[PDB]
Each structure stands twice: as structure tokens, then as C-alpha cells.
């Protein structure tokens, strides 16, 4: 059930150079089409303005209306949905605001009740969203 020979080092090698492609944890990270469809250019964060403010429901077991934002990036000009993670911190978000967006916490997947949103908002017009909540900073009006 193996090669195991002593002049076979090439076949053990051109087999594993072939069967690595079926490890989806490796096919994604080593094929140019996986990163291309990423709205980020592989970056950690990406700035971009806010072009509306919309809410999205939750999955079947538990009901709610998660609040979100329709952020358009400036890097690629794409359009993505960004969750606004905080308690009632949709009062500081406004149209044409240039918010900073980060990965949601599952390396390119949804999390929990939120359907189809993989992005959360960390800053809002160059002030930290945590700072606005706890009050340390203040967004000038």
C-alpha cells in the first residue's frame, strides 16, 4: 500500500506535490483565485465610506434585527456589508463617514445569527468605536 522503495524518492514526492491540492485549507491559501475574490486585498483592515445604513435579521432559532452598514471600500471600490458591533452604537454612523472595517472573527465566514456579513467596524471617521461607547473620546458634531 506504499512505494517505500529506495530509488523512489521522486514518486513519493510528485505524489504529495499532487495530493496537497485536495487540502482546501491549502488550495485556498495557495491559488490566486481565492485571494482575488476577497474584498480586501488580503489586508487586515480597509477604510471606506458609508453609503447607507441597513439592518439585517437573524437566523431561525433566535430572532432579532442586527444593525449593519453598507460600507463601500476605497481600495477596490467594492461594496460590502459591515456589522456595527456595539450596544446602540448606530447613532454615530452617518452617510459619507469613511469608517474602518475589519475581519469579523472567523477568517472569512459569518458568525452566529448574522446572515452573510463577515465584516465589523472598528473606527468611525478616525475615532475608535470603543472610545465612543465608553465616552473617553467624542465625535465633534
Amino acid at each position: 500500500g506504499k512505494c517505500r522503495g529506495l530509488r523512489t524518492a521522486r514518486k513519493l514526492r510528485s505524489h504529495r506535490r499532487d495530493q496537497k491540492w485536495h487540502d482546501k485549507q491549502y488550495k485556498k491559501a495557495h491559488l490566486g483565485t481565492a485571494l482575488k475574490a476577497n474584498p480586501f486585498g488580503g489586508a487586515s483592515h480597509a477604510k471606506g465610506i458609508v453609503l447607507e445604513k441597513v439592518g439585517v435579521e437573524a437566523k431561525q432559532p433566535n430572532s432579532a434585527i442586527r444593525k449593519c452598514v453598507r460600507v463601500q471600500l476605497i481600495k477596490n471600490g467594492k461594496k460590502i456589508t459591515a456589522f456595527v458591533p456595539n450596544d446602540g452604537c448606530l447613532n454615530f454612523i452617518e452617510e459619507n463617514d469613511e469608517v474602518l472595517v475589519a475581519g469579523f472573527g472567523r477568517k472569512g465566514h459569518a458568525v452566529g445569527d448574522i446572515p452573510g456579513v463577515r465584516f465589523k467596524v472598528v473606527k468611525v471617521a478616525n475615532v475608535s468605536l470603543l472610545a465612543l461607547y465608553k465616552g473617553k473620546k467624542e465625535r465633534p458634531r
Partner: protein
């Protein structure tokens, strides 16, 4: 959206706004570990 986005921070904003009391400065330093060792293994 069906009718949403009207309520946001409904709970944070109607909870009572109670104030805090600052009495003892429990600085960590190292007497913390002196007494944090002396909560467990003194009894």
C-alpha cells in the same frame, strides 16, 4: 428592513445611571501577590 432601525440603544439609555464609589486604592504592585497568596494559603 421592515420597520427596524428606529430603536437602537433602547436598553442603554433607560437603565438607571448610578454613580461609583472610589474608596480604596488597590494598586496591583506586588503586595497584591503578597495578599493574593494570603487569601488562599492562610486558612
Amino acid at each position: 428592513v421592515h420597520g427596524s432601525l428606529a430603536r437602537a440603544g433602547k436598553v442603554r439609555g433607560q437603565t438607571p445611571k448610578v454613580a461609583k464609589q472610589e474608596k480604596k486604592k488597590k494598586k496591583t504592585g506586588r503586595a497584591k501577590r503578597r495578599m493574593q497568596y494570603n487569601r488562599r494559603f492562610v486558612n
